[PDB]
Symmetry: D3
Subunit: 322 residues, 6 copies
């Protein structure tokens, strides 16, 4: 067993690097205050956009971008080391390739102050977000109490194949950090439950409290059990700390022991009672197409939104918003 | 739009071919009565095991197995032609390959009395079910009111990749016929919603009212909108007819028009705003593994249930239970 | 199976025998209209006080009391014969013993116009009700679709021993007719479920819509399955007809077949696995006391309400309120 | 007022006396940890099977049986004395009659380390359980804050006459300890509420978290008020401590003061407004039959499950499973 | 009593007067179909924008504006006369004053084809709506079954003073027709209840199913009783007809008879028990200010949105958008 | 941000001044215990009737009446000063005009022990309450964390114009203290939400636990956000302390920044997009009538309850109950 905390962090309007700097210190203070309030906490999770805020007019500028690792990550690392916790942070990351747009990035730091996981948003929330598609796949790392942690970012949680990928690489606690999941709220709660059940793992998810100096009741905190049951649903309050005990080994034992419920095994081993080992070929043309890089929906040639021109982005490519 | 009916059919105990012919006449009587009571109905759906019941001591015997097509499906065809409806039926199907166990099969018959869809359960419920894993993939047919119909069977609905496959082939109304989906009731309801939302399609799902001559309140009927909202949830009553109006073209239009919510498009075109067309490589190791027939969970080594031995089934392959 | 209807009947203020005859014609009109609107209905149930209302200043007067049988029940009999339904009616009944207060009585009339069940409220609602405690025990009759019907009246439904008694005599559909079961609404719903589950029988229950010429949204209609699940809960509307299909034989089969859930059997055959037949002595001092007419709670000494003095009723016995 | 705690205790697989020994120490540690966490707690309740676990292959063997009192109870007593709490424990008890099967037993120990209540399961959960029917009736004892405590075991809570018996002997806080009440879950919650309302007493109930080294989310904790309202419903978590304040004197005052709600008085005093003292004869043939030891259901001669042969028990009698 | 129907009307995209005439014929077809399907219906209610849709680029153009009365309302009148129902329709109305923007208007037509009520939206939804604030106050008319009907439009229903005004003029059934009341869904449901309870009247309210050729599940239909209880809440389906029986005289009787609950009376007769007649001066500075045309919030000075500039509208007055 | 606490205070039967004295000390002890338990609490709220109880036979007597300020208020002031909190208290206040009935009064004391707000119930709960209508309007004061506080008493919360008045004078946290709001329970919860939403302010409300030495589960505690969402709903328990963090400046910023949601501004500025400044005349005859002191409902001449004669009060006027 271990105690997790998801922070419904309220981010003020961010207009400069100095605002970002104060925000980092706010996150750090919140981290220590949480560990003081909950002395047994081992994993503390901050929402998407909680470092740099949501200034859609400035968020592509060099002033608003960070390196991972960088001086800001080292401050987060120091705080994790002092508090002796795992921490999850959201950073809009300057692309090491200056000819590409920045990434939407998540890091897990351990109680030693080492970054043990770095994840780039694989499915940017299009057509609104300008972030370059992640190139680091879906990584998994060792966490507290026998957990194998993985993080996705917000809209990523809408993709069941991504939750499957985390599980397939060993994840038993799947973290989702979100920036604004309100107005897609039912579906966020829905997929947090389905991501858990489909894969026999816990899910721990958080949404940012707010970003606009006015309304800070958009926050969410949800912990789902490996059967898909919501164990904890937070109230929406600014600064709300949503907590619960997680037993990663119980998820592992379900995966080891269960028959009827073992859907993650059944996927690659269809009908193993009648056919020893199961049928290893799933069915399933989309799987073969996507592996080959030729996923194509039958209605693609009549679709309306296929680039960011509806929000004022170039449809050409390359770097922009400097 | 078209009106759909899902029948919470109660099957008695089945001890003979006499009892199976009785079920067939009962289903046909129910079909006509539903059309009489709901003149606008275009699609009538019967649950898994509604033809042959759930006699686990007899269900692999020749007496308990039918051909698809055969004289029995011809009777169902006659009824659909007479009622001028589409009908969905469950048949445990004799495998033409005598070295292999029977299939668990679903058919859709059109208002002309033609079988327009034949599907063999891809994911038998293991370790309890002895059905051979299906070999007809996930087919889609033309249905009423602009629908593209596909059917899965019970446990199939737990596999999110299979709902994706149906969608990828055009499905906008995904039918799940179920036989004993109680005791996993919460997870059944959950995935009926997630299957809909993930893929921007309707789901229409039904469970058998009962099978044991005693308890007939296991029935379910659930219709979900393409946003994942449950539109209709039936009461649990034997013989309950759960109906609802479906608008397949509205699902089509969502798929054509939506940007932020268009997860099915995003899967194969990740981050198309900064990279034109998006990245066609999703991630994503399990997809590539499964496509190649080499999906392997890291913990398969220590798993307890990988054959039907717990239920007394032989573990070496071939035809059994005759 | 048979279809049942419970009528959320609204009674006006009753100030005369003229008003009572008006209620009688209104109930009869409602009975015919229900049969017209629901051609399959076999059992129609009216609430407590639906014949004579709730005029606490007149309800013990000769003008406000009827004989059972009498010309009024003969009119109800005529209606049931004409409609070919079973009907349940409430009558405040003149006590043939002139030294005793009237009874609060319910009858069931069959489709032949015969009174096949007569029940006098065993547990008048005290201290407010002046009705003489019933002396006809808890009778059971033959009803439609294989049912064994029994009726209790309102406050009667709070006594779990009485639901047991009905069951012990064969009842598989237990009817509760109620007159002002608001303000105890939660406990009414609760016991309708527990009465069903405890005894493996259906419960069908109705409350009067209102009685005071102003507020007619006190009505309830609730049908519970033999497992205690509420199958139907009506909206609160005056004149609302709450209907549902009942399957009395399914309750019979549960009682015949069930082991773990068969609490009604267990009561008189405790632990039959280690002791054949079980122990026939349940425990159990109150049972023996009550059987002997000597049930006495340890705190009776200090109880505040043991007569009708709070309501102005005489405390010495005999006929009053004439 | 006093604070109660119900422990959703997780029991590991038990294969030997040494496993039982470690389990006892686990319970003891949990007891002290609870009192440390909740300094005001006065009553701490452990679930059914929490001492010896659930090893249905070994639970009738001498190695798996204890005496009450015995060295194991004295360890529980010592812990209660040190912590200064009342504690409730579950013990499968070797029958002092070697020709009879063991009992399913519950004890209450006071803050002095004295066993002040010993209860043997009156209604073993047949046909699965081998325990001999209890012979100690339904005892009641003095507890904290003016409570009169009684305990039933699991399936016992399904019998309303047993809750009535506790109340009749003075109980105002009725404790139910359960081993696996999941899958009869709705009905457990239902009867915890009805047992309370019927008798104007609090109910405090707990279910074992799990028993199989895999799944530990079967736990329940429920506190009902004397009006039947659920005051506290725990989340299901291993090790969850469900707490609430109980005011036993408030239950007593309701019993002393109430009229309309006083169903427990009405049972033995039907219609006391019309008939001074009420009618002392309830109605009620089953009551007379059960007092005489001749409770007989009309359908008994056609029942299917009347001995433990469906699970592999002798139908002869005597001691077995050594 | 009378039966009411609220239509969850789906409007396509409207790009022309051709499309508006199409909506008109669609509404008329719907009106007849509703009467055919619900023979007892006396009042049929269509949502805001159901005639002309929600084309914010064209909605102020002459092509998109109608006269009230005009040839279009005459067609609606013909339909109501033919169907013998009362109908409620939404019309964006050309302002006869050419220096002023059009009104957002609702009419009620009686079964004789007469316009018996004309209302211009008093509270346009600002800053998004350009409609001139209504100048016909809050009128009330005679409706079916003893009703006094009044209609407000969408955002109007957020103003509790306006529901009071309708009531003060006699209204006992308050109709709210709405066009895009999603995203404020919780507050819409809430105020429909509070408008009813505050004033002891029924509320009947409807929202448009959709307007954008894609999503038509925004529809709502809600009927609240005069105590504030929701009697009927429709499912969200395009074309859904939400019906319910209304009893206007029961609301009248509450207003006549009730004491404690009679808040509408209390407002103008505060504390009439110690001061005969009550105090006629309510308090109460805003009432006096608003009456005098000088309502001013203390923070108006620092408010951000006090004109339509955020939406591109001119801020200086006069007719625009032609 | 600041933490509020509402106390579900249980008041015993009060028969003398000495009982009142002990009750005051009980309130004081509760105040200190709350601040000790919740060290960050800044505002502590006691329910209506919590000082003098509810003795309807004695509550108009001089012995049962207090002065405000007086020696009893000074004891409350001392406690607030020592604990360094704002406190809200209920006092039945002797009228300084001996020819008038006493007031139902509420006070707010600050952490300096100064009474900073005094409010007399404007709308006594007629026809039951004898209190003289309040003459101090609806005052507002400065509270903790940038709040502007106002209090209403119980039935006052049923009047939306009163909540509007508080807001209009700057209130951003509207407190409602209630004596017995049960049986008007739904409507209390309803209006706590609507009072919040209508005015974009928080509401914090509490009901007295009980008053009769028997039942103390009538308590309520509810905190609503400025969007009308219930943030905290207490369980009903005697002595329950319902707490939550309030961010008064967030309410202020919503009022400053919002457009579509800004109903409080729209009331006095109807249609400001089309007409610069909005239309300042609301509509609205009742407003003009009430400002002029001639509020008159159309049905007033046929109303039944217009004085306290139904409960035994003089209909003449003046002082009574001495």
């Amino acid at each position: 067993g271990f105690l997790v905390a998801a922070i419904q962090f309220p981010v003020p309007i961010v207009n400069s690097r100095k605002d970002i700097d104060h925000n980092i210190e706010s996150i750090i203070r919140t981290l220590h205050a949480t560990k003081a309030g909950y002395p047994g906490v081992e994993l503390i999770i901050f929402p998407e956009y909680s470092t740099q805020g949501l200034n859609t007019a400035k968020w592509l500028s060099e002033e608003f971008l960070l390196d991972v690792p960088g001086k800001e990550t080292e401050l987060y690392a120091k705080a994790c080391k002092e508090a002796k916790v795992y921490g999850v942070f959201s950073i809009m990351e300057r692309n090491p390739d200056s000819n590409k747009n920045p990434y939407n990035t998540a890091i897990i730091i351990d109680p030693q102050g080492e970054i043990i996981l770095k994840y780039r948003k694989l499915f940017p929330w299009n057509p609104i977000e300008p972030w370059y598609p992640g190139d680091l796949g879906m990584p998994v790392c060792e966490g507290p109490g026998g957990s194998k942690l993985a993080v996705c970012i917000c809209h990523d949680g809408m993709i069941p194949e991504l939750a499957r990928e985390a599980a397939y690489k060993g994840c038993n606690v799947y973290i989702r950090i979100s920036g604004y999941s309100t107005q897609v709220n039912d579906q966020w709660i829905l997929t947090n439950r389905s991501n858990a059940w489909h894969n026999l793992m816990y899910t721990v998810s958080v949404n940012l409290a707010g970003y606009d100096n006015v309304f800070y009741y958009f926050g969410e905190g949800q912990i789902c059990n490996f059967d898909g049951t919501t164990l904890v649903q937070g109230h929406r309050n600014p600064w709300e700390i949503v907590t619960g005990e997680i037993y990663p080994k119980m998820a592992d034992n379900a995966r080891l022991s269960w028959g009827l419920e073992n859907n993650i095994y059944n996927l690659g081993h269809r009908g193993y009672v009648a056919k020893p080992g199961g049928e290893h070929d799933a069915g399933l043309t989309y799987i073969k197409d996507l592996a080959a890089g030729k996923y194509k929906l039958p209605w693609e040639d009549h679709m309306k939104i296929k680039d960011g021109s509806i929000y004022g982005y170039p449809t050409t490519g390359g770097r922009f918003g400097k």
